[PDB]
Design a protein around this ligand. Sequence first.
Ligand code: ADP
Ligand code: ADP
Ligand code: ADP
Ligand code: P3S
Ligand code: P3S
Ligand code: P3S
Ligand code: MG
Ligand code: MG
Ligand code: MG
Ligand code: MG
Ligand code: MG
Ligand code: MG
Ligand code: MG
Ligand code: MG
Ligand code: MG
Lengths: 429, 429, 429
Amino acid sequence: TDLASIAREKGIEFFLISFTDLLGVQRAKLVPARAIADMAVNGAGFAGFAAWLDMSPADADILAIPDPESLIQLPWKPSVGWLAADVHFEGRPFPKAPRVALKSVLARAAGKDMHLKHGVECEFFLIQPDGSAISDPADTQAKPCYDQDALMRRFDVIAEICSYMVDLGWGPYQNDHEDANGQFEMNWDYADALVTADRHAFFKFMVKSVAERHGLRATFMPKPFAHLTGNGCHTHLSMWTAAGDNLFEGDGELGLSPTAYAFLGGLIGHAKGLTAVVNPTVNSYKRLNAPVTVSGATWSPNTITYGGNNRTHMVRIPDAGRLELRLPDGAANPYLMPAAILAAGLDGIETQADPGQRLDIDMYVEGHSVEAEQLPLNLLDAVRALEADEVLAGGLGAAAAAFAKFKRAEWADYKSQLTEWERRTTLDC
Amino acid sequence: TDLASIAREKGIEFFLISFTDLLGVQRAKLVPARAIADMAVNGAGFAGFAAWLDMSPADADILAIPDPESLIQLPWKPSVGWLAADVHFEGRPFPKAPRVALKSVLARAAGKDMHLKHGVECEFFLIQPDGSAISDPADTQAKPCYDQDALMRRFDVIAEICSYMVDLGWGPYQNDHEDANGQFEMNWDYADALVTADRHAFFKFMVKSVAERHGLRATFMPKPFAHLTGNGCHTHLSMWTAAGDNLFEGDGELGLSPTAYAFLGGLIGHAKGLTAVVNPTVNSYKRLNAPVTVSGATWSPNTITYGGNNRTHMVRIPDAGRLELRLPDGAANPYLMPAAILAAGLDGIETQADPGQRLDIDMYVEGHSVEAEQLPLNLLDAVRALEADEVLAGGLGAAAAAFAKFKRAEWADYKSQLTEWERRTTLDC
Amino acid sequence: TDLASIAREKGIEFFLISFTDLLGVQRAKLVPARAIADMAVNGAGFAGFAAWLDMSPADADILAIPDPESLIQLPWKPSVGWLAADVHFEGRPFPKAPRVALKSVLARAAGKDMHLKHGVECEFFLIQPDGSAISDPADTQAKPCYDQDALMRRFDVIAEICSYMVDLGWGPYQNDHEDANGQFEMNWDYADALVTADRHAFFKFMVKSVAERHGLRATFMPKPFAHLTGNGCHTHLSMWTAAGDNLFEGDGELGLSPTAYAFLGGLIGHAKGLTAVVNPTVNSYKRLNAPVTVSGATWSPNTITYGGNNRTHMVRIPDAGRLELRLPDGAANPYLMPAAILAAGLDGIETQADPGQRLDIDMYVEGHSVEAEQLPLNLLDAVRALEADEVLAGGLGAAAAAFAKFKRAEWADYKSQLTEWERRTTLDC
Ligand SMILES: Nc1ncnc2c1ncn2[C@@H]1O[C@H](COP(=O)(O)OP(=O)(O)O)[C@@H](O)[C@H]1O
Ligand SMILES: Nc1ncnc2c1ncn2[C@@H]1O[C@H](COP(=O)(O)OP(=O)(O)O)[C@@H](O)[C@H]1O
Ligand SMILES: Nc1ncnc2c1ncn2[C@@H]1O[C@H](COP(=O)(O)OP(=O)(O)O)[C@@H](O)[C@H]1O
Ligand SMILES: C[S@](=O)(CC[C@H](N)C(=O)O)=NP(=O)(O)O
Ligand SMILES: C[S@](=O)(CC[C@H](N)C(=O)O)=NP(=O)(O)O
Ligand SMILES: C[S@](=O)(CC[C@H](N)C(=O)O)=NP(=O)(O)O
Ligand SMILES: [Mg+2]
Ligand SMILES: [Mg+2]
Ligand SMILES: [Mg+2]
Ligand SMILES: [Mg+2]
Ligand SMILES: [Mg+2]
Ligand SMILES: [Mg+2]
Ligand SMILES: [Mg+2]
Ligand SMILES: [Mg+2]
Ligand SMILES: [Mg+2]
């Protein structure tokens, strides 16, 4: 069946033909069902410079061609169908568009019979619409993680969204209040990277939209409050043959194969550049290497290291047959994040990279007793690392340079902003 | 029947897989019904350091394995089923988890054919959401105990909660307004210790949840107002054989057996360390040994003594065949409280402990006369006594040392806080 | 010099025995005239850890021995005499004290018959006491530099201070409104470095004091407003023989000698580490490499370069026989600044350092035109450079290590502060 028939069968009156730009912003046209057939073949036209794609106002329209397999009837508004799209320019997929960049990396891995599957942990906060405070003034205790009371106080919002994921078939399996006051996490089944990436992009839209209907606001900001735990977007990772075998399952340490350790070697080896992509904002660097929070731990990475089932490192091994990359934050691009992770891991496999020694220690407490490379400390340093990393920059194609350009502009803007701390501590010099 | 079938049968859309931590905080994940079968067998995963379990962020996930027999469909929201769970760590029940600690003491006792049954008197206040005052501004008289007017003014909340307990089969039998303005008590049938402990944990959650739905707020704080009676959590206690005989029933004084008096002897003998557990907060020590209240009596213990049917001692004998321990307050952990009480009682029975002479006097008025040992006067001293008590510390296992550690941290935090009384009386020194 | 007799003669009732700590803070004891004799010999005691000296509370008292030659009767309150002092510890001048550290460098240069003389341009803003805005709401035009109206609107403050400098014999010669709205500059004759350093320390204190008496507030903050020119503290520099000849006076380009150019070579060669000392705050790095201001130019350095009479470089040659280092800002330590500049310049002279090619262009406009090294972009990088620079670190001795430690701590504190720009631009990620 084609989209026009489906629209008629399911009662879809409009479609959002949607794409994700380099900064993660969802761009779309809302097209009435009468126009979907033509759009589905030829794509919907956009002026690319108006989005974060690093183009020019003089360029021809890009055409975003929807992937009919990605269709989602908005569970909160079923007369509307959401579609993920590949941006095309000059008759070909446009290499600066995140989804296109990911599919390229995926195609290279697939040609080696290695298929990335991943799940995302999209932690978010529920806050007042004005952004001044969390949504629940009674959520105050020092260790609020897994709080039953505060979770159930937001039951209506959380249950509504979980039930939508049940109906969409994502296989959600748990929800909780997370470690910061105001913060939540809703988990669902991993899938082929592309599937998860589209789900990741839609999920954020869904949470934000539903929150708003409830008179709340959701944020995925990496570090919205200085003294509270931040928003991670941990990525659990495994690589599979087309025949359905998990290449990461093995007889080695912690139930991992040498292929899993080499992939891990790639993450470790390329970590500095990876950070630019998966911690893509100035604020990202206040979540990494952060002072101890009120709850007693940041739970985010400080160092380029890994442990076993241990949440104090860049990588955790949570169970046999997979790796948890704890590095990414809530701002990480749903498509660029897996693309950069795969480029790194693939190079790790191809070069049989050594991940180094597993550290079975609490890095927050004992990191001083061990020599370990620190992660890049600010956005500018991460971006330089990205630019200097041939495997990453090469693997992401033109997206990498465009991304770096934008982040450098953001940095230049940020660095000129006077802060209150400066006024307080310098006025009397 | 398994949880998945029950969910379909009864229309349960989500389960709360819940455990109680060392500070009594309810920790939970909300899992959709599709995922309960896996969770019931393997348990829900948590990072234990994020709760009050005294672990490390570097530790592997604990697994909370729900007890299917504990299942409660939330009477105010039947699409959600609540389950109490045992925390497991590294393949075994985690001894720092209160519910596990209790089960361990129960198993020892049960190996001697002695089964603890207890009922709890969970006094609470209904207060304004902001915590500034009690919920009912017309509840003002000096002696408000059993006030018909003020009870019926909160009929809707109280009656709703009692009806839920009727329907859950807890066998509730009375409700009243208690001795402080704003304060209430709802009583239900005693049961095997583990059942009562689970019910106790659920009850506080239910009262808080329903209070909130009525625009009100419930608190179990031991001494929320300095001039009014505090919140106790008295435990009525008896020991039974597997065959169904109450070992406390006897031919001695007041219808008690030698076994009852030896148990009492353990309570008396271990009372100092027991206080740390059942009066577990700084504020607990403002309910114990308190100045007379507006109603004419504190009704809380001052001394390590017992009476007959007499509410002025640490222990009351309310009727043949049971003891009322009046020591515990509203902050007492639903699992550690019975665990510590049992450990002391068992040691009393095993050593044939002598509880001493029953005191048939009003200890508030005639205490000055008799030579009696006073209870610990503050949290720090009570905790010292706990650590010094081999039977208690040993019987609670690693929970004892974890608990002490947290309480010491709370004390240190508390002792540095400047109070208004100090400013008023010292500013002009 | 007999301070007791002077007190009687000039009517001095109290002395401020004053030292400058590593962060530039003026530390002092106010001693009645009856006690000056004893203090002048033995010093006034302080607990050094309570100031920014990097000591320990377990250390013996430091003793601040006043320099009677530095005596200044507060022109606005002549019953008080101010004295600059050298901190001593365990019987020897304390090497971490800025004045002591400066005198050490001066002594080395003096042994080679080279005597540093310098003048300082202590730009400041006059602001509202609450620090929210500038003091004069009518000072608003885009190019306010040398504004006659706005200067005369603050005649009373400016004139009062200038007349004080006339009377103290400092040889003031001009005052103006500077390039930022609210900003002013008052200039006086150069002198022997130690003399200028003491005058500099006193000047800041006198301006702040007099501003306050007029219901205003003075700040020397490097960049108090993002869009306006910042506060520099340019130093004009020359080296003299004990016989009274200016060694910088010469036949080379622009009336400079080979010695001047070799001194300049030290400045250029050591610029990266020098930045840490003369741009000592986080905020300093918003004045350097700043975006264009409303007035059309920042007038501060971006690059490690020099020009002729040209205000767009790190060093300007303003006239025959001297150099202007435009690098330092208003937070520069009055003693550490000259000390570090001298260490760098002496090394230049000793190694006949080559300053490179003079650039006769506007670096703000034609920086892209030529390869030039950029100055450190932030405090942490500048401090790192200080530590790696043997001449500077060695030249300032222990003061450099201690300075670097405090500034690292400042950075740690600063980098965890959430800013409004982050909230605005990241909440919707
Ligand atoms: N073999 C696998 N490869 C990739 N992801 C997996 C694999 N197995 C499970 N996952 C996914 O990993 C994610 C785990 O999330 P979560 O339960 O929140 O982990 P955590 O223990 O870090 O809190 C889920 O999305 C899950 O589906
Ligand atoms: N043999 C027993 N052992 C333990 N608890 C019991 C026994 N008999 C009754 N109880 C319980 O004791 C509790 C009494 O509560 P309550 O009526 O408020 O007592 P009181 O106000 O007199 O102190 C109830 O939970 C009741 O079920
Ligand atoms: N030979 C010299 N060595 C050091 N400083 C000098 C020398 N000659 C003049 N100065 C001082 O340099 C400073 C010049 O300040 P200023 O007039 O504000 O210069 P400009 O604004 O042109 O940069 C004055 O303090 C002046 O006394
Ligand atoms: C409890 S936590 O470790 C918290 C992570 C933190 N929010 C962060 O990554 O910044 N998350 P999880 O156990 O779900 O992996
Ligand atoms: C009337 S009272 O004695 C009050 C007890 C008091 N609230 C306390 O234990 O602090 N309780 P009960 O008669 O229910 O045992
Ligand atoms: C007009 S200016 O060049 C401005 C300097 C600026 N305030 C700065 O150095 O940041 N000062 P001057 O001419 O007095 O040397
Ligand atoms: Mg998770
Ligand atoms: Mg999480
Ligand atoms: Mg995780
Ligand atoms: Mg009762
Ligand atoms: Mg009662
Ligand atoms: Mg009772
Ligand atoms: Mg000047
Ligand atoms: Mg100037
Ligand atoms: Mg100048």
